[PDB]
Design a protein around this ligand. Structure first.
Ligand SMILES: Nc1ncnc2c1ncn2[C@H]1C[C@H](O)[C@@H](COP(=O)(O)OP(=O)(O)OP(=O)(O)O)O1
Lengths: 202, 202, 202, 202, 202, 202
């Protein structure tokens, strides 16, 4: 990554490398993996971002879909930012330079520490997160329409499943509740908070 | 977080990220989780606070209730602190800026390191802890009225359950004691310390 | 804590937070927990000391007894050190300020880094350790009078139990020994060291 | 490694040493091991690279093949860069000096921190990765021709196996699909993205 | 401990605290525990040394014997170095000051960082190691006279037991060997190295 | 160890101490332990090297053989470098000073940080590694002559055993192969690389 000592390059740590590998192994593409990726890739160069992605052993269907999203975003960058070099001067980054495939670590450091900075690490992380959100959505197992409260299921456990599913996918909470809780929630009226609904069906 | 090197931004560590995720997995919303959250979020930016909250996989009913509390506190901030920009100058933070949803990391750093400082991280942590305390209270399984000493239960074990329940929820200690210990505690008289009561029923 | 970089504030580490939580989980209030608490709270502010105490999930009977001891010591501080402010000047700490309940982190830093320093962290740790020693003594399961050597118990194992019990509670070593070892220890005479007694009954 | 404090030598950490040993033990020569090697050897001297390779206990067939690749690349370096010393001056590195077998740590530091730098660590890592890719390819168990979707296998699981195999080895995705999914994928037409194909056979 | 930043005090780390506690739990008073103690207490103040000793939960017979040795060495220090204060000046350390029982942390820092330094940490560690060696010797289970090679025991395994026992306790190697190996070792003659003896009976 | 802050002494870390102890416990004297020792002892003083060796609990036959090698190398040093002191000046190191038995830590620091430096840590590590290689060779269980490919053993698994044994001990690869693979390898002709031989018998 690039961090303050002045902004300088540091090697990606074994702790960071191990943390990302283990979260993907344990959680796959559950929605909470994306905030973890963003946090573990704080200050990351494009090289560091590729390192994190390439160290993942499984899920190569997802990793191939991520490449497609990256190539789509890279092509859109080139359309908006065409490139035209002067000896010892900074070249303009194309899409593949931002993605780390045609740029060196020194060029990436040169862009990220410039004044004003050309934040190639943050631009590329945005493309990666965009691709990761699409993977989270596709690998979401259930529709919100099929999350309904069981006859003896606690309302809290049902609401956990409801908003877990909604997070992966992205009135109905009351409609999908069981007969006993639904009748209570209808009686509360409009403008009921989640807290009040959960207290009522407790 | 923001820490002294002069006050500068540092990346949230894998250790901090992992610690928060594991305590929530192991303890859910037991009352002791809130002091752990506050300690792990020492010097945290609003971005860091969102990172910690968003990395939690389960408990999405609770996380949705937390958003409602955050929105309520954000709306109250806007009522008390209305916003009105001058090129290259610091804008006034609204509720959603304090919550990290409409503010950038650089703006958050700008507020937190200003002289005098506008501590958006500490203001937002206060809102989060307020919301977390409400969740702790709702998820408390038992009323203090139902914590009574068993016939053969040690007084120490009963007092542990009593103040555990009282912590989650928030004369009666003697009333809820068993016949044998109650008679001893009545004989001690007024002004008895917990130490003296526990020694007496040992 | 407060440490040398000049004396500056540092965030309590996840390692320290985790270490204290796990020792209490594994050892409860065995006497060796108190030296571990003191070491883990090296340079601790009153806020840090409260953090460590409040992160403990179980043992709320003990934690309530600790509050009583803290309030007793705080009341004794106020009797000896009554408080009387001048703009931008340091106020005098009362008992509740030393205990971290009515003081801010900045005030605690202000006292601890003053010249001369008002060491509120060390004063409060003294009160906490005083309260923790009382808890260790009450939770000690056995009297030293009931620690006697078994017919086939090795003398070393008996001496381990003897001084383990004595540590928790706080001639008799010979009296509580078994017939065979007692006869040997009587024959050694006065002024026998523990080493010599243990070698004799080996 | 060599890192910024000015560029200075640091000892390879126990964490780095342990991380490399464990990944090889757990993953053998799965393709994702090579990006992990490159990341863990960030800033590595030739001595550090040899340390990492020599600490591997098993897989001595692979380690011997790696030596052959290293010797081939070293011989090609000597053909392109023949060596010709002046007291207290920097000598030109031959292939075996880049590989760390005939050079000292001080000479390696001298080359890597020169202005302009002769990056012997990065040149040698390139040779090692070249040799490691050949080992990954040989130890790949299955041809892409033999990765075909099962009658009841989910398309996602089949695509995972397909691109896992393709990564180790390096129209057909549709041909190797099962009758039901193949018919759907043919109906999509040309220019179908992986996302669209995976959604169609879901 | 006291370390270079100029020599300054640092808090004993949770890693050091945990390491010492676990080695004592796992190894008891096997001889290799003493070099581990010395290494973990590198730069330690008398307070740090007491912390390490006091954090040990079991083995209170041994810890009491250690106190006796410490008191003996402290009494011998007072005989050789009698003490006689001038405002704001450094007092002379007595035995109990070196042992950390009657000295403060600031006085210990004052002695250890003086020019010339009065190394109270190293003097006390010497006394502790002296006491720990006596405990290792007493808790050694077997005499070297009873370490004899079995009929089918490999010579290497026998030599391991022989020098393990000799280390705990502190021609005979040949005498205690089995008939077959003894005859071979007699035939080698005088001046045989351990390597040669072990190769011969392999 | 001695490291750059200027070259200064640092305490050996608990991580380094633990790493060396565990590798010896897990791997004994497999050849890969020697590169791990060298890496973990980077910048080590003679005191640090003794610490690492003395913290090993088992294998006292091997540790005694290591002392013999150390004494042999120390005696050879004294023959080549005889010693002859001037107040406040650096004395010449004898063999036992390099081995850390008759030298203090300050003298070791004095030699290692001199200009020009007398690298007593690196000289002693060389002697230790020499002794460790002899132990690896003696504890090697099998001769390379007895490593032959099984009737149904994969060639890769056989080559792994072959070069594993060769590493511990230090045309035949083809001779020791099974009838089917041997016939294939003979047909390849002279100048066949290991890669080509392994591909042929796959
Ligand atoms: N082979 C394995 N099987 C099961 N669990 C494992 C394995 N390897 C590692 N783990 C898990 C269990 C342990 O709790 C944890 C070990 O990491 P740990 O030593 O606690 O980190 P650490 O505290 O040394 O890191 P730091 O360097 O930050 O102190 O990882």
């Amino acid at each position: 990554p690039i961090v303050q000592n002045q902004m300088v390059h540091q090697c990606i740590s074994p702790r960071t490398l191990n943390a990302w590998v283990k979260v993907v192994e344990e959680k796959a593409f559950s929605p909470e993996v994306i905030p973890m990726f963003s946090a573990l890739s704080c200050g990351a160069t494009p090289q560091d971002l590729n390192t994190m992605l390439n160290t993942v052993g499984g899920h190569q269907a997802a990793m191939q879909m991520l490449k497609e999203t990256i190539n789509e975003e890279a092509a859109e960058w080139d359309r908006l930012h065409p490139v035209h070099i002067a000896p010892g001067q900074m070249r303009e980054p194309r899409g593949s330079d931002i993605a780390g495939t045609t740029s060196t670590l020194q060029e990436q450091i040169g862009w990220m520490t410039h004044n004003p900075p050309i934040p190639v690490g943050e631009i590329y992380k945005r493309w990666i997160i965009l691709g990761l959100n699409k993977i989270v959505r596709m690998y979401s197992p259930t529709s919100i329409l099929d999350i309904r409260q069981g006859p003896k299921e606690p309302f809290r456990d049902y609401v956990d499943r409801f908003y877990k599913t909604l997070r992966a996918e992205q009135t109905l909470l009351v409609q999908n509740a069981n007969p006993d809780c639904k009748t209570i929630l209808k009686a509360l009226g409009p403008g009921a908070t989640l807290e009040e609904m959960m207290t009522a069906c407790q």
